[PDB]
Design a binder for this molecule. Structure first.
Ligand SMILES: Cc1cc2nc3c(=O)[nH]c(=O)nc-3n(C[C@H](O)[C@H](O)[C@H](O)COP(=O)(O)OP(=O)(O)OC[C@H]3O[C@@H](n4cnc5c(N)ncnc54)[C@H](O)[C@@H]3O)c2cc1C
Ligand SMILES: Cc1cc2nc3c(=O)[nH]c(=O)nc-3n(C[C@H](O)[C@H](O)[C@H](O)COP(=O)(O)OP(=O)(O)OC[C@H]3O[C@@H](n4cnc5c(N)ncnc54)[C@H](O)[C@@H]3O)c2cc1C
Ligand code: NA
Ligand code: NA
Lengths: 481, 481
């Protein structure tokens, strides 16, 4: 067995891992990247890229059926499932190819093929062929799909993101479990593509939305289009000869048996930290067996072992994994010099229609920091997109936007939005939060006409008029003497 | 003839005028609004709203024909012209009604019906019935269509924004004339709705773009969809029995005769300041008889007479007219106490597909700013939307974006974009400009994945690499120690 010494070993050649490698190489030449599976990152392979590709097809198909409002009729929209799948697959391959070329450009001696596990706090074994002794180690192993036990009975008809995009044809029908980002994006897209869909979640959850009014509005809006029970009681999902039989109670509590060609487990993903031999370290774990970590430095309780990307089960977003990589890589490279990452303002997006964006502090974080049981030093500004001019012009007038502000200073804290162009409004808001703008300042910014951003102006005015600050600092337009 | 004294008289009850009234009424009770035409504002009646309404219908129709990229096919797309025109009309009547309700709420004695002209610098006459003795006067009379003499031979078949939206049905064919941006917005929309259209522009102009490369790429792009000659040489447009005969030279310079059902003037608006009896005042005029005015205070050479909105032939955009009304109303209301408006960062949008946005300083204004245009003290960061991932996923991968930055400081100066979602990126960029951001700082902002704003990241990196700041003293991600 070959033994190698490195300053930095990075387990996982995904987004976080490749970011960690580039960062760590600026501090030290002695960095290895280990990869047990296919190169290309989860994002380009079976993540962001194919899912967005699926969505683009779905929205082209769906919007073609919604032109009558405008005075146009479209006859026989027909979904060629083989074509839909082929396009997704070929574009997906193209994206993966770019990552593979980057991986290929790295020094051959810096890449080791195989699955790593810890033997002790400085020794990794990769398969049965190599041992790496590393001064510092970065766990960048991502997440995998995961599902409750009952879903396992769907057998060979159980889909995840790992196999959904490899189908040669679109399915006839899919039962989707998991009411979060992936589950709603994929269920809606499939439903828009002529697939018979129902989406079941259990806890009342809708995407990552925290506000109760928002969750209910979104759930009801989705149900105008396809079946979505955020509080479903599901008995079983059992593979038959040609289908999966799903036994569940509907919204009227009526027991229902219904066959679906497939089930999709868009349930909670699992961080890849359970199969890496952590029990051979003193890494402290929470009551769910997730590694505890410093959220600024990415250090576990073992100060020379870091955890980055989906592996730390936090900020499980692509751009965040990339930032995690920079933090873990720099800190692994420069150790024992340790710095804290200055995180970008939180930005989270769901590519449904209408879209969801969450920006800045979440509602729970705001309640924690700006309120208690009996008093609040924050206010909420709101707008409905139903009566918003441009949204109505486009026939997209559905949605709600909540904006949160410090009640004393007017500092913009965060937001939730379910509505059109939420992805873009999310950026606008996220840049405003990172700059620590106040709502009064943001009201002085440009708002064109007629645009969706004007809905944001409405929500900001709503918040502003609730602030403890003087009436006469409520100028939306500044004049100087 | 009945005579009234006011502190402030406002000529024109559109966007600028209604704004001026509200601002003026904060300072004094004696203010009147004079209106010669229909209430509603130009924006709501025959401007932004119905044009955006036509565009949305156009977009749905066209996108319905573009589904095969994604693997979806249609049998047929059928454009019911009458329903298309009706929805535009009913929706705009809705928007107009809101404006009308506001006007109706204003004190009866604050509103005079008729066209005003100056008898002298403190006296207005409204038609033949009223004279207003006014301490301060705001000219907020908007702009009107203007076109060369040859176009007038199109007689009852000449269209402008004033009558286009009033057609009971979509025309079979329309020739559009002039360099006006409205020509591209409306021409493309008409074309996308099945109307046979040719756009004959002038002098190389393309949607107000200033960069030579951008203009050419945009003209080429548009030409993949509809006939557009930015340098057209046109002989005549003469009304016949059921159409207009257009005689012109095609793109190879050959004299061509073609019938179009209507003709649409897009030849640049005229400010309504030629029929106000301005000869009865000492107001200083430029060589094209536009009143000179202070761009910050909106005062003419006569210090108690202001000019606001499209009337001053500057920043002829809706939200800028609103700010104009605010500046002019405040200054007219509080005269002799005068203040300088602090303008928002420039933002203009052309709602074609792909969209156009210009942000901050124009290219001309940048070239002016630098004493030594040789020594090149600004940089250009560039991106093509052709290889931009999300844009490709959506089948929207056409366009370019230039960002401008000071070479020493990296101060973000302004931008031009032709690309998907330019309206939204335009806002993000305009907020960044108003907050005086550097390109270095903008790169520390959140950029989600996979999104169109990742193209902005590419362009910002391109500018940044070119800066004279210390090469490895601008990190994209900040860490503290
Ligand atoms: C369907 C779907 C859609 C998504 N859409 C979006 C979106 O639109 N926007 C967004 O921001 N995020 C999206 N995400 C989330 C995003 O994909 C993740 O945040 C991101 O890919 C995580 O990056 P990573 O580097 O941590 O993980 P990965 O890219 O998975 O890297 C982990 C790597 O480590 C390897 N590995 C695991 N164990 C070992 C071992 N022990 N030894 C060696 N190698 C190992 C794996 O093979 C893998 O290559 C989506 C995710 C999914 C599943
Ligand atoms: C087709 C079209 C599309 C457009 N789209 C957009 C867009 O998408 N976004 C954008 O920002 N801008 C757009 N614009 C520009 C926008 O409409 C103008 O910037 C805006 O309307 C100017 O408003 P205003 O108050 O200055 O003029 P107006 O709203 O026209 O008000 C002037 C008023 O004065 C009255 N008047 C004139 N003379 C007299 C007189 N002597 N006595 C009494 N009353 C008088 C008129 O009747 C009118 O009511 C568009 C314009 C057009 C034509
Ligand atoms: Na993470
Ligand atoms: Na103006």
């Amino acid at each position: 067995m070959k033994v190698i010494n490195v300053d930095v070993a990075i387990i996982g050649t995904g987004t976080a891992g490749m970011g960690a490698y580039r960062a760590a190489k600026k501090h030290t030449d002695k960095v290895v990247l280990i990869e047990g599976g296919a190169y290309g990152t989860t994002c380009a392979r079976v993540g962001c890229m194919p899912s967005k590709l699926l969505i683009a097809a779905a929205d082209a198909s769906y919007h073609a059926s919604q032109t009558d409002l405008f005075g146009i009729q479209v006859d026989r929209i027909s979904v060629n499932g083989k074509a839909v799948m082929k396009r997704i697959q070929t574009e997906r391959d193209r994206f993966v190819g770019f990552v593979v070329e980057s991986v290929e450009s790295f020094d051959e001696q810096d890449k080791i093929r195989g699955f790593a596990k810890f033997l002790d706090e400085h020794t990794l074994q990769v398969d049965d062929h190599s041992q790496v002794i590393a001064k510092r180690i970065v766990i960048a192993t991502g997440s995998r799909p995961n599902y409750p036990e009952f879903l396992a009975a769907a057998g060979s008809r159980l889909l995840t993101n790992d196999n959904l995009f490899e189908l040669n044809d679109l399915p006839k029908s899919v039962a989707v479990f998991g009411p979060g980002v992936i589950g709603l994006e994929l269920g809606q897209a499939l439903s828009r593509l002529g697939v018979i869909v129902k989406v079941f979640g259990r806890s009342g959850s809708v995407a990552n939305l925290q506000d109760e009014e928002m969750k209910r509005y979104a759930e009801k809006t989705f149900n105008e289009e396809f079946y979505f029970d955020a509080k479903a009681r599901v008995i079983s999902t059992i593979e038959k000869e040609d289908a999966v039989e799903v036994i569940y109670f509907d919204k009227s509590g009526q027991k229902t048996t219904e066959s679906f060609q497939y089930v999709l487990a868009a349930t909670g993903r699992k961080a890849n930290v359970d199969k890496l031999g952590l029990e051979n370290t003193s890494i402290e774990l929470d009551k769910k067996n997730s590694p505890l970590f410093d959220e600024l430095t990415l250090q576990t309780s073992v100060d020379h072992i870091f955890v980055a990307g989906d592996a730390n089960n936090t900020l499980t977003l692509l751009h965040e994994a990339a930032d995690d990589g920079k933090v873990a890589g720099t800190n692994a490279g420069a150790y024992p010099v340790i710095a804290q990452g200055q995180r970008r303002a939180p930005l989270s997006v769901v590519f449904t229609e209408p879209q969801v964006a969450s920006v800045g502090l979440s509602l729970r974080q705001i309640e924690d920091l700006y309120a208690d049981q009996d008093a609040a030093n924050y206010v909420v500004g709101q707008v409905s997109f139903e009566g918003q001019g441009r949204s109505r012009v486009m026939g997209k007038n559905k949605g709600l936007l909540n904006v949160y502000a410090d009640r004393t200073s007017g500092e913009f804290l965060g937001a939730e939005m379910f509505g059109p162009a939420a992805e873009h409004i999310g950026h606008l808001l996220a840049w405003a939060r990172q700059q620590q703008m106040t709502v009064q300042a943001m009201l002085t910014m440009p708002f064109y006409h007629p645009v969706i951003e004007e809905g944001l102006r409405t929500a900001l005015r709503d918040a502003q008029q609730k602030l403890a600050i003087e009436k006469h600092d409520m100028n939306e337009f500044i004049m100087t003497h």
